[PDB]
Amino acid sequence: DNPYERGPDPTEDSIEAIRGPFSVATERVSSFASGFGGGTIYYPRETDEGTFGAVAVAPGFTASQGSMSWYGERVASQGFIVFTIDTNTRLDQPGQRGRQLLAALDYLVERSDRKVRERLDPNRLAVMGHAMGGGGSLEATVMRPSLKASIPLTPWNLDKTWGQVQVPTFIIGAELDTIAPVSTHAKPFYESLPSSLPKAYMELDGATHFAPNIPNTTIAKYVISWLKRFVDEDTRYSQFLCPNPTDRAIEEYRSTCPYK
Ligand SMILES: [Ca+2]
Ligand SMILES: [Ca+2]
Ligand SMILES: [Ca+2]
């Protein structure tokens, strides 16, 4: 058996749910934390199924953790520790955001409150972020190839080459994005990721740049599935990723299914 499986067997409704099987508590981390601007940790309360993997979540240029706060309970309740962080400054660039995502994960492993630490599997970590924070998700995987998953949301980065990434990466784009256009950011990132890498591109039909800051069942259900598959190695969730999703909200989905 897979020792990392958590919660009951999934359905399309269970990954679409506003609330998963686990109840959620929070721990606040002040900006005096080393290497990033603090944040909020969301974690599952029930301990009887074992420890959980974690994902650090970055906001974009000009923004703060509040723009990302809806991922907190919705994703943690599925069986994850979720760390929505603030950056050192609102003007930090993607490389900097990448370093701060890693500093946030290292805080979780090394210095977080006992309540979080006792629930955390330090071996199974992921990154996610919006816009320049999504560019930071990419940056982080080059900086630390041992990460289990990466989800750049409407990502922004001047660096278009990602041929060395080894971390399973799920890029979500917004069709009508004028700030980080899919034509000049999301799509060239996806095309540059190795063809041998477990990866997926999902473009949201008619969506604007700020769609990742607005609760979105299409985003949520496949974010949860991606994290389950790669942070937990949970092949119960392969069914939602392969074959490719056909939801009406999706303008395009491409992938490197199967994920062996
Ligand atoms: Ca700090
Ligand atoms: Ca590069
Ligand atoms: Ca369209």
From TrEMBL:
What residues bind Ca(2+) 1, as annotated? 31, 33, 36
Q: What is this protein called?
A: Cutinase
What species is given as this protein's source? Saccharomonospora viridis
Q: Which residues bind Zn(2+) 7?
A: 159, 161
Start and end of every PET hydrolase/cutinase-like domain? 1-258
Entry binding sites for Ca(2+) 5 = 175, 205, 251
Binding of Zn(2+) 9, residues: 203, 252
Encoding gene, per UniProt annotation? Cut190
Which positions are annotated as binding Zn(2+) 2? Answer: 12
Q: Where does Zn(2+) 3 bind?
A: 48-49
The entry marks the following residues as binding Zn(2+) 5, namely 139
